[PDB]
Design a protein around this ligand. Structure first.
Ligand SMILES: O=S(=O)(c1cccc2cnccc12)N1CCCNCC1
Lengths: 20, 337
């Protein structure tokens, strides 16, 4: 499922920004 | 009558933007209790004002590290914005000061935690719960966009829940006060609008794109574009191929379809009726916009709170000692702070 696909990405925790 | 409020809110903000505030406090006036948050150049602490016994969140920036990571202009801009803004979903700055080592910003403690912990714990919010939050964000943006501010950093990690169960926005690190366009690659991958990824030269429409990602993420439990790596998320974003779970109402799909619109010139919030296209949308038909502004609506979720200075809705972080140096550091770079 989509839920399971989301867990498989490893981005279920706090997400950082990118800078320059 | 909303346009008069904004014109009066605009003149208020412009005065406080040109004639602001400096060294309104000192560090030994506060007892440091616990770390509520970390980050690359700083930490946020629950402090207790000893004089009064009131609790605040204190943000502590290391001056040397801010210089290292080329963030001078961002930290200065956050402070400036925070003392000039006034709106019930934007956190209040009580004191700012600095010493040899550190910049300090003292704000109101918001004890309910990040929306993020709440949403991962419950899994998803029902459509009305999700709508309650959305509506608060729609007014905040209307406020900031009239001031010419673009926010750029919307995600559940950056929305806190107060005692009444309403939202407070902190983090103006990336907000930029401009009329016209801007070009910086900045933000968080899942929430970057396509024009940002394609290096196009972009505007406040990015914020409404972000509101769609947030509404989707709130009602689904997960963002609409993910993958192992930033790059492969960006590929999904520019394609504009949203799939919606089956439990989404058709009214939500329709709005989401109008916010996650790849093309700038048909995206809701960027058309001629402006923010009114989002507020008159059918998904928000039951929504009393004034009553939301006045905080007169029973929140559908209220976080647990056991007394003043309770940190139970925040993570545990590793406590470090406050290093204050005997030598002044980076005095020229931070004169305006
Ligand atoms: O929770 S915080 O530490 C925080 C910041 C500013 C004011 C706050 C007031 N009360 C609680 C937490 C606060 N925060 C910084 C870490 C990144 N997540 C967004 C907010």
């Amino acid at each position: 499922t989509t839920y399971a696909d989301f867990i498989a990405s490893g981005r279920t925790g706090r997400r950082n920004a990118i800078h320059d | 009558s909303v346009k008069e409020f904004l014109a009066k809110a605009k003149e208020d903000f412009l005065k406080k933007w040109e004639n602001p505030a400096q060294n309104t406090a000192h560090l030994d006036q506060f007892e440091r209790i616990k770390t509520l948050g970390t980050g690359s150049f700083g930490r946020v602490m629950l402090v207790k004002h000893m004089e009064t016994g009131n609790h605040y969140a204190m943000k502590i920036l290391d001056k040397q590290k801010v210089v290292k990571l080329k963030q001078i202009e961002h930290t200065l801009n956050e402070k400036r914005i925070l003392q000039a803004v006034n709106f019930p979903f934007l956190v209040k700055l009580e004191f700012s000061f600095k010493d040899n080592s550190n910049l300090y910003m003292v704000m109101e403690y918001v004890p309910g935690g990040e929306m993020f912990s709440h949403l991962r714990r419950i899994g998803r919010f029902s459509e009305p719960h999700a709508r309650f939050y959305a509506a608060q964000i729609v007014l905040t943006f209307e406020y900031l966009h009239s001031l010419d501010l673009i926010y750029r950093d919307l995600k559940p990690e950056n929305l806190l829940i107060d005692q009444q169960g309403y939202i407070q926005v902190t983090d103006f690190g990336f907000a930029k006060r401009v009329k016209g366009r801007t070009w910086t690659l900045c933000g968080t991958p899942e929430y970057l609008a396509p024009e940002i990824i394609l290096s196009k030269g972009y505007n406040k429409a990015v914020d409404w794109w972000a509101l769609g990602v947030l509404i989707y993420e709130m009602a689904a439990g997960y963002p609409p574009f993910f993958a192992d790596q930033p790059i492969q998320i960006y590929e999904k974003i520019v394609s504009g191929k949203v799939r919606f779970p089956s439990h989404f109402s058709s009214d939500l799909k329709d709005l989401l379809r109008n916010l996650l619109q790849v093309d700038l010139t048909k995206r809701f919030g960027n058309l001629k009726n402006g923010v009114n296209d989002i507020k008159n949308h059918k998904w928000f038909a039951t929504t009393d916009w004034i009553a939301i502004y006045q905080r007169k609506v029973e929140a559908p979720f209220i976080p647990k709170f056991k007394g003043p200075g309770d940190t139970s809705n925040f993570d545990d972080y590793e406590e470090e000692e406050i290093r204050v140096s005997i030598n002044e550091k980076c005095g020229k770079e931070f004169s305006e702070f």
